[PDB]
Ligand SMILES: Cc1cc2nc3c(=O)[nH]c(=O)nc-3n(C[C@H](O)[C@H](O)[C@H](O)COP(=O)(O)OP(=O)(O)OC[C@H]3O[C@@H](n4cnc5c(N)ncnc54)[C@H](O)[C@@H]3O)c2cc1C
Ligand SMILES: Cc1cc2nc3c(=O)[nH]c(=O)nc-3n(C[C@H](O)[C@H](O)[C@H](O)COP(=O)(O)OP(=O)(O)OC[C@H]3O[C@@H](n4cnc5c(N)ncnc54)[C@H](O)[C@@H]3O)c2cc1C
Ligand SMILES: C[C@H](O)CC(=O)CC(=O)CC(=O)c1ccccc1
């Protein structure tokens with residue numbers, strides 16, 4: 001973390017850079033180098049907080065000339081810990097948070113360091129939105145380059161399915177635009193290929209009009225898991241795109257809507273919404289609320305920006321996390337039993353086994369149209385361990401790996417954005433052989449030296 | 461609109477400025493010049509979208525040299541239309557949206573063009589917050605320089621009560637820090653004095669840990685309006701600082717939680733929350749919900765970021781607005797009856813007659829401690845007309861003025877941030893004589909040429 005740098009190279013960076021530099025001896029260094037995954041404790045040589053595209057060009061050129069390992073940081077949410085490095089440089093985009101929204105064009109342009117909640121605030125000023133993840137302080141940058149799904153996805157696709165162009169700084173310091181008609185090969189690869197191809201300084205999206213959404217959340221005893229998960233699996237196979245319904249298996253939070261005698265016990269938390277008219281949504285949600293005996297029901301009509309800010313009401317932010325995730329093409333009764341066995345073993349309050357159903361608009365995009373793999377698998381399961389005390393790391397980590405191995409016969413692929421710091425080896429199976437080959441071709445062209453390799457990495 | 465500018469002074473500005481200029485010939489000019497009050501239709505000679513403090517210094521100096529009337533824009537929410545001008549320059553801060561948050565120091569440094577939702581997203585990543593307004597796409601900038609109140613205010617004060625310094629670009633193009641120990645005279649004036657003193661490029665705040673919040677919204681028939689409003693006034697007089705409860709008199713929205721038979725009829729929408737433990741919140745909110753017969757009750761436990769994003773679930777963003785507001789020291793039975801008569805006339809589905817109760821932490825700050833007036837008046841009433849069709853402007857504006865004149869014996873002061881385009885003349889009465897005089901002296905010092913006059917303006921003494 002205290003490497004010898006060239007004075008000419010350094011000075012050239014200083015003259016070109018208009019942002020904020022954070023060095024190891026600076027008072028804000030330990031706080032700045034922390035990322036969401038608290039298990040990742042790494043000490044960069046330098047954190048460069050970029051404030052403009054020309055700043056990113058300067059930081060990229062400086063790292064390449066200096067031989068410093070490049071971490072790129074948008075919102076710092078990497079489950080694999082990719083947005084901080086030991087001994088290298090963090091090209092930190094988090095001050096590049098501006099968004100421009102055209103109401104007449106239903107378009108937004110957002111800088112690559114934006115948090116979802118900033119982007120949603122900006123488009124919802126015009127009752128507009130486009131799909132993104134469900135936790136507002138996630139980074140737009142890493143989430144969109146890996147695909148991006150959330151509440152709007154069954155109706156409007158992945159984030160990348162609404163992306164119309166990007167501005168990107170490539171490894172040789174060039175600034176490029178990529179779109180359907182400009183460097184379309186790079187445009188294909190950034191839609192699902194992660195940070196492998198350059199630093200995205202601006203994303204442009206088409207937007208949709210999204211008015212108030214009927215939302216429900218309720219909790220079922222984990223004793224009713226078999227019927228609840230079977231109701232969910234069966235219902236989602238034929239459900240309108242406008243319905244999204246996700247199951248989180250977890251210890252019940254000590255919330256006042258829930259009876260005190262359920263607090264801290266195994267439950268399924270079901271969250272559902274109707275993307276469409278709220279009277280229709282009231283009718284569609286009432287029809288799924290009795291998958292089991294409902295407890296702690298909350299029903300609300302929410303601005304979409306409030307739906308985005310909702311996940312999840314808790315009194316503590318988990319410090320340490322470990323995830324194991326895959327897709328399923330079908331969720332059999334045997335897999336269902338496996339999930340429920342493993343869920344019964346959760347013994348800490350922040351851990352969830354999540355069961356998502358995508359499909360809808362995500363699955364109608366032809367599989368070769370972007371770099372995002374697995375569009376035809378509707379189910380995602382994520383063993384998301386989360387806890388506080390470092391002495392417990394082995395125990396929580398074992399829980400997630402044990403569940404993943406028990407399910408492994410039922411799982412395929414993986415979402416690159418749910419990969420953990422030990423899953424570098426999963427990249428080829430996540431994309432599959434044809435996509436991975438085509439991604440390697442694009443890599444040979446735009447990042448032939450593999451300068452950007454803190455990501456689910458595609459070697460050229 | 462196309463004034464002749466000096467070409468050397470323009471190229472110097474352009475070499476110095478890193479942001480975007482939008483001229484009247486540009487495709488995006490008509491959209492960029494629109495502000496939230498769509499009754500305001502003005503045509504700047506230039507919109508300069510600043511990206512940094514040096515951008516702001518370069519735009520200020522260019523305006524001063526060029527003789528251009530200066531509009532400053534944060535999030536564009538000015539009820540008086542101050543963030544756009546005819547024929548001058550808009551120093552548009554909307555791209556300066558960065559927030560740094562220190563969890564260890566519980567401190568946030570936010571740029572002056574941030575929207576509230578961007579700020580609350582950033583602080584809530586650490587479960588932290590500080591008070592601000594209730595609508596996410598409001599600008600931080602104008603709201604804080606006026607004082608700034610919302611759900612966290614009874615517990616934690618105005619936004620300005622949590623402000624610890626600013627970076628500010630003054631009329632002469634200088635960049636200053638104001639705080640308790642540096643230019644403290646300016647620090648006092650900016651905490652409530654609007655944009656009078658310069659362009660704030662960075663605000664620094666102390667933050668508070670705010671976990672999930674029990675929230676309730678319900679609607680009462682206007683037939684029970686006297687009972688509900690009296691219950692509310694009486695309850696708030698002795699209520700814990702942790703309870704906030706606001707009343708919005710409006711047409712009932714066509715939402716599925718309300719019976720079809722109430723839709724489009726005037727009702728009281730009551731919104732309440734407990735800033736504190738949610739089990740205590742559940743107890744406190746159940747105790748106030750039966751002030752009348754509740755309809756369309758929604759109760760939820762929300763992260764504070766979701767409480768901030770909740771107001772208000774509607775299908776349409778209103779285009780045209782007109783507000784008349786003031787404070788009350790007491791809400792008598794006669795004033796209540798007046799509010800109810802005027803609410804019963806509401807025509808638009810977007811209009812509301814708002815009744816807010818501040819007090820708590822806001823009133824505990826000594827009156828002379830900031831430039832924000834009326835801390836000791838706990839009630840605010842806002843007749844907030846909002847609609848779509850420009851041919852209706854005279855009817856909606858007349859409604860808000862009639863209600864204001866009917867209440868005027870009960871009203872004192874005025875929140876600068878709720879003034880409309882026709883209220884330039886309200887500034888002295890809003891601040892009071894002693895505040896207005898002290899502000900005039902600070903004005904004489906920092907903006908003696910009144911370069912910043914598109915605001916609730918304080919001329920220099
Ligand atoms: C609480 C939580 C909830 C989540 N929920 C969802 C969800 O609902 N849906 C979903 O799809 N995913 C979700 N995720 C996963 C998420 O998509 C990934 O964590 C994503 O990589 C986070 O992006 P980021 O910018 O915050 O992370 P970072 O750690 O900053 O970056 C992640 C990766 O992207 C690269 N990167 C970031 N910004 C850029 C850029 N502008 N240009 C180039 N490279 C970039 C980094 O180099 C790194 O490889 C969530 C994550 C968290 C922690
Ligand atoms: C829908 C809505 C909801 C509201 N809710 C609340 C509420 O809950 N609580 C509350 O207290 N107020 C609230 N307000 C009123 C709000 O505080 C004022 O409208 C405020 O002036 C808006 O600030 P802005 O930056 O968005 O507006 P702008 O129109 O951009 O600016 C308003 C004024 O401040 C100046 N200004 C803006 N940014 C700066 C800056 N960085 N430096 C110097 N001067 C600047 C402008 O020159 C102008 O005089 C709300 C307003 C709206 C439209
Ligand atoms: C925090 C966890 O590790 C990961 C997540 O939070 C992701 C997640 O919950 C899935 C998700 O995006 C989603 C997508 C559609 C509907 C509901 C939820």
Ligand SMILES: C[C@H](O)CC(=O)CC(=O)CC(=O)c1ccccc1
Nearest residue numbers: 593594609610611704706814816844
């Ligand atoms: C939209 C209108 O023009 C103005 C508002 O909406 C402002 C407003 O409601 C006041 C406000 O900040 C508030 C403060 C505390 C509780 C509830 C509301």
